[PDB]
Amino acid sequence: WCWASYLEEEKAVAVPAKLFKEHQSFPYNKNGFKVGMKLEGVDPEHQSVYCVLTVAEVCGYRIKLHFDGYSDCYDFWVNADALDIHPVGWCEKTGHKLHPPKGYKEEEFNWQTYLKTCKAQAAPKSLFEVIPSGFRVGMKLEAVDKKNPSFICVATVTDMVDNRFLVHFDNWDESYDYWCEASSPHIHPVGWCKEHRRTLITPPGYNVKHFSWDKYLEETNSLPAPARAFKVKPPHGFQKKMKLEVVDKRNPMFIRVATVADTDDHRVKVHFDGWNNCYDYWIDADSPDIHPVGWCSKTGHPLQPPL
Amino acid sequence: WCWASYLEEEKAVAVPAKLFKEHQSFPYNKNGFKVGMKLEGVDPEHQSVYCVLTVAEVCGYRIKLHFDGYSDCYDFWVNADALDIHPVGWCEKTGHKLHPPKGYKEEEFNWQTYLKTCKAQAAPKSLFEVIPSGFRVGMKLEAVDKKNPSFICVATVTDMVDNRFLVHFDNWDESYDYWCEASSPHIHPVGWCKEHRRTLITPPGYNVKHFSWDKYLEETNSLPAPARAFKVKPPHGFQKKMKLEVVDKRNPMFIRVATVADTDDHRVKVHFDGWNNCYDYWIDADSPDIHPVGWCSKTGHPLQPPL
Ligand SMILES: c1cc(N2CCC(N3CCCC3)CC2)ccc1CCN1CCCC1
Numbered sequence: 001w002c003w004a005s006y007l008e009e010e011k012a013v014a015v016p017a018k019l020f021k022e023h024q025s026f027p028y029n030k031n032g033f034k035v036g037m038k039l040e041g042v043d044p045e046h047q048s049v050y051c052v053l054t055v056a057e058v059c060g061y062r063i064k065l066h067f068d069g070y071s072d073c074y075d076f077w078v079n080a081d082a083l084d085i086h087p088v089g090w091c092e093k094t095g096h097k098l099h100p101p102k103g104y105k106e107e108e109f110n111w112q113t114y115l116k117t118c119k120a121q122a123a124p125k126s127l128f129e130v131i132p133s134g135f136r137v138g139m140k141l142e143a144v145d146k147k148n149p150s151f152i153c154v155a156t157v158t159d160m161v162d163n164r165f166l167v168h169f170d171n172w173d174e175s176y177d178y179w180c181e182a183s184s185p186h187i188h189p190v191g192w193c194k195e196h197r198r199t200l201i202t203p204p205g206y207n208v209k210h211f212s213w214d215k216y217l218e219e220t221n222s223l224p225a226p227a228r229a230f231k232v233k234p235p236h237g238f239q240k241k242m243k244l245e246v247v248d249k250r251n252p253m254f255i256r257v258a259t260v261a262d263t264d265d266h267r268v269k270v271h272f273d274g275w276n277n278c279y280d281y282w283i284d285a286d287s288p289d290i291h292p293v294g295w296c297s298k299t300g301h302p303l304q305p306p307l
Numbered sequence: 308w309c310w311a312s313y314l315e316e317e318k319a320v321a322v323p324a325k326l327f328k329e330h331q332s333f334p335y336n337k338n339g340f341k342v343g344m345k346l347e348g349v350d351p352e353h354q355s356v357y358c359v360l361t362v363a364e365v366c367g368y369r370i371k372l373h374f375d376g377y378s379d380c381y382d383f384w385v386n387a388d389a390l391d392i393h394p395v396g397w398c399e400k401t402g403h404k405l406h407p408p409k410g411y412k413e414e415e416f417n418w419q420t421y422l423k424t425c426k427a428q429a430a431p432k433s434l435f436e437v438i439p440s441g442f443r444v445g446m447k448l449e450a451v452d453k454k455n456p457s458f459i460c461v462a463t464v465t466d467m468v469d470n471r472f473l474v475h476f477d478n479w480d481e482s483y484d485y486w487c488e489a490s491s492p493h494i495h496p497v498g499w500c501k502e503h504r505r506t507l508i509t510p511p512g513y514n515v516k517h518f519s520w521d522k523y524l525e526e527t528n529s530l531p532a533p534a535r536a537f538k539v540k541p542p543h544g545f546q547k548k549m550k551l552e553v554v555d556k557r558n559p560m561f562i563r564v565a566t567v568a569d570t571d572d573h574r575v576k577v578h579f580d581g582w583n584n585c586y587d588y589w590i591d592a593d594s595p596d597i598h599p600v601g602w603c604s605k606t607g608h609p610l611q612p613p614l
């Protein structure tokens with residue numbers, strides 16, 4: 001099976017590699033991770049929480065991570081250059097809380113003892129990975145609940161690591177938190193909802209009858225994020241019918257031959273060639289899980305042909 | 308394509324219809340629901356919340372429900388006899404709160420006005436569907452977080468409809484709530500964790516250093532559920548290699564030819580014939596989404612053959 005041939009047969013073009021951001025395109029590195037190495041990492045379903053993780057599988061430029069002491073059902077795939085993994089010791093060095101393995105309490109855990117207990121090694125620092133901005137921990141803003149994207153709500157930046165920061169919805173469960181960057185289309189400076197005739201969702205258990213950002217910021221002794229820090233996402237250039245390689249959301253070990261079925265400002269609707277259209281789904285055009293044609297061959301990862 | 312033949316070729320037996328509970332087996336009714344009818348129903352991701360719903364699709368004995376005013380991305384399939392759908396007016400008749408469509412406030416909503424606005428009809432009462440027990444709203448108990456099943460926690464029965472009741476985790480987000488029955492393997496009478504040397508998770512922001520059910524029940528002026536009400540789930544008889552019809556979790560419009568790959572006391576691991584084993588997954592053996600061979604043919608629903 002060959003992309004060049006397939007592209008000729010289908011009279012179609014590949015999405016140009018140059019439209020993909022660096023985290024999506026060909027890596028300029030081999031995958032050094034080995035099964036059994038241990039590291040720290042963000043829980044994708046509880047994104048404020050850093051956890052103890054073990055590399056459970058290696059495939060091309062991707063690794064499958066396991067939360068020590070928890071069920072394999074929670075195992076997740078990231079790319080070898082993911083931003084939300086960190087070497088052993090990072091939490092302590094950076095002042096962050098590390099959630100211990102299932103069955104330990106914090107006071108029973110540290111890395112030196114745990115590595116001896118497991119007869120295991122930390123993933124070397126050398127395997128892991130700037131542009132300044134006006135976002136600081138503590139600042140408040142208006143953000144889309146990614147799980148319920150019609151709702152825009154009062155949020156706070158609660159953590160920050162280099163160019164990414166963490167959005168939390170004041171008085172809402174942690175599980176709604178997510179990491180993003182200054183250009184995210186999901187975040188808005190205070191009083192953006194006013195200026196656009198949109199409903200701002202206010203914190204549970206609050207003066208909802210006439211809520212005020214000014215009063216709230218004083219009552220919480222907090223600054224707003226400055227409008228100048230909110231940078232603008234330039235549109236992606238992806239076009240319908242262009243082909244690419246996509247991680248199958250529904251079984252993420254596989255990467256599949258895919259087609260751009262539809263677009264909007266910041267997303268593409270992917271379609272797995274050979275499969276029914278009812279499998280198609282939306283994904284951010286900057287996702288690390290979509291790739292230029294040839295990414296699998298270049299990285300050593302198997303590619304699923306059309307069904 | 309024919310089950311009888313396939314079963315001969317594969318030298319396999321169907322799971323006996325008689326091992327399936329009434330909500331899984333052949334219905335003794337046609338599907339009267341029509342596209343466009345409106346009703347009330349529980350939100351599967353927010354199970355304490357009753358919502359305004361419209362029938363968006365009809366297929367065999369199943370219906371696909373749409374949350375008025377919200378994205379189609381939230382559409383969900385139930386069986387025509389589901390317990391958690393209700394006719395127009397039920398919430399008001401039963402004293403429950405009805406969440407209005409996206410874009411209405413409660414005070415702007417009632418059914419008579421809304422049906423005139425939409426030029427639409429309620430699903431007749433005749434389309435909708437006893438065994439006494441000692442569970443009452445307000446009672447407390449110990450329950451498994453179904454999303455994090457290693458954790459057993461302080462919970463409260465917060466709602467009750469005939470034989471089902473709703474479990475809520477005290478001081479935790481509503482999204483963790485779920486409906487169940489008196490025989491659920493996920494619920495336990497107070498001090499079951501003591502009697503089994505298990506850690507009870509206590510409510511956020513509580514005397515965790517030496518938590519007491521007795522003190523807590525007085526401080527909340529609440530009764531415990533009596534041990535006598537906790538009935539016992541008899542094991543299912545499903546055996547490996549037996550065949551059945553299963554709703555595809557990952558694309559629930561489809562029902563597929565399936566095989567029991569593994570079992571435990573209350574679950575079966577289903578496998579879609581023709582597909583890679585990495586698609587297999589666990590499901591409660593009493594789920595309304597698994598069915599006896601021939602269920603699709605009897606009900607008018609298409610059946611996906613093996614890949
Ligand atoms: C249930 C839950 C919610 N919310 C969940 C919480 C949500 N966010 C939590 C983080 C900021 C706001 C705010 C809205 C809104 C409406 C419902 C009931 C209607 N269903 C929700 C999706 C399908 C319809």
Ligand SMILES: c1cc(N2CCC(N3CCCC3)CC2)ccc1CCN1CCCC1
Pocket residue numbers: 043046049051067070074099452455458460476479483508
């Ligand atoms: C994150 C969240 C939680 N919880 C989420 C809340 C949960 N339940 C809420 C309803 C009752 C208890 C209690 C445990 C536990 C551990 C973590 C971090 C570790 N990851 C969780 C699943 C994979 C590892």
